[PDB]
């Protein structure tokens, strides 16, 4: 049906030694032939991380890039440059970009149609902050985020959606598998009625936010929870345990 | 006296073969000893550029970084990972960053304090738009931008300032050798106000705004123009002509 995807966002972490030891353990882990693993390092180690990977199921992605591949856009990342180096994914739209780094939904929307225009796969994130949660505004916000992408992008084959309760981001208190299933399935029938039942049925919807070694098995029999976006334990050994969580 | 300095801000531009092509031209061309050349590629290509650099004057620097070193800040570059890959400089303030990406002056200041503290040199940019230019806001804008820094950073030994007349950067006109001289000299004495004659006497102010092979020699017997922050011509081969403009 859909393939189980485990994305590992490293974040502003990782040195050449630590990238050596993480992608060394992934080449040594015993994972299913039938699993999709994307490690997303800081751009300063993407080229290195692709030198190091020797397991076919693990491709490498960047964590942010800009919506034009060349020019005077100092400080920025480019899809063409990460692609040259051999990476196949870019995370667009993290709780650590939109809040702090002032990324407006249209900014992510336009960014997401140029990336797919360029061959790369996108990891798109959507998420409500605890007050939007306190006021029963979760779906109302997620649809608002998705709809800006939706007004721009119409083939979402190489798109994955990453739902991140902002209040579960690397706090240690995740959603329960049950709470997460409801919203995932809600996002999918919203995305059925906006894209088709076939495309809504192919799209992967990753849960993100305090996902870790021991709680991944509780999300084991959750149909609309197609994988995981692992931030904090992406740089821990229990990362293979979240990749073998349905194994 | 002040050492000649030539910074090469590549912006969002390059590929492995281009950065290979470019570093080899400097790796073998005639360049004065005691000139200071810093090439600033995209973050993806920083590690490789350092493996490629062989001519000692030439160090690599990153085009932008955050005010923290590790953590939850997706898409950001870290002062330590640039150091890890071996770049010795970070362009900050630079000017773009203020316009499209909205970096306020104090964001820059704090990022300069932390950056120097981390032991990485700062190329610091300053400048006014055509709207502060025709209004006659020029000097009080730069004094505000520099004052912001000045309150945080109280040692300026590994700082080079860059004045990008924003009415020139990528527009394709270089505001004269004469009014350039006068803006640098103005801002050298404002710094001397805030750090004494001593500090100001050794600090470098580089003219940014369209500098190139054909014209870098008309900035030659200009005293306060201590170097250049080349954008576009860094890619091109006249970048070598600009390291020899001052003979």
Curated annotation (Swiss-Prot), chains A, B:
Disulfide bonds: none annotated. There is a cross-link at residue 222 (Glycyl lysine isopeptide (Lys-Gly) (interchain with G-Cter in ubiquitin)). One of its GO terms (cellular component) is mitochondrion. Keywords: Gluconeogenesis, Glycolysis, Isomerase, Isopeptide bond, Phosphoprotein, Ubl conjugation. The active site is at 94 (electrophile), 164 (proton acceptor). One of its GO terms (biological process) is glyceraldehyde-3-phosphate biosynthetic process. SUPFAM superfamilies: Triosephosphate isomerase (TIM) (SSF51351). Pathway: Carbohydrate biosynthesis; gluconeogenesis; Carbohydrate degradation; glycolysis; D-glyceraldehyde 3-phosphate from glycerone phosphate: step 1/1. InterPro entries: Aldolase_TIM, TIM_sf, TrioseP_Isoase_bac/euk, Triosephosphate_isomerase, Triosephosphate_isomerase_AS. It catalyses: D-glyceraldehyde 3-phosphate = dihydroxyacetone phosphate. The modification Phosphoserine is found at residues 70, 214. Present with 207000 molecules/cell in log phase SD medium. This is Triosephosphate isomerase. It comes from Saccharomyces cerevisiae (strain ATCC 204508 / S288c) (Baker's yeast). The lineage of its organism: Eukaryota, Fungi, Dikarya, Ascomycota, Saccharomycotina. The gene is TPI1.
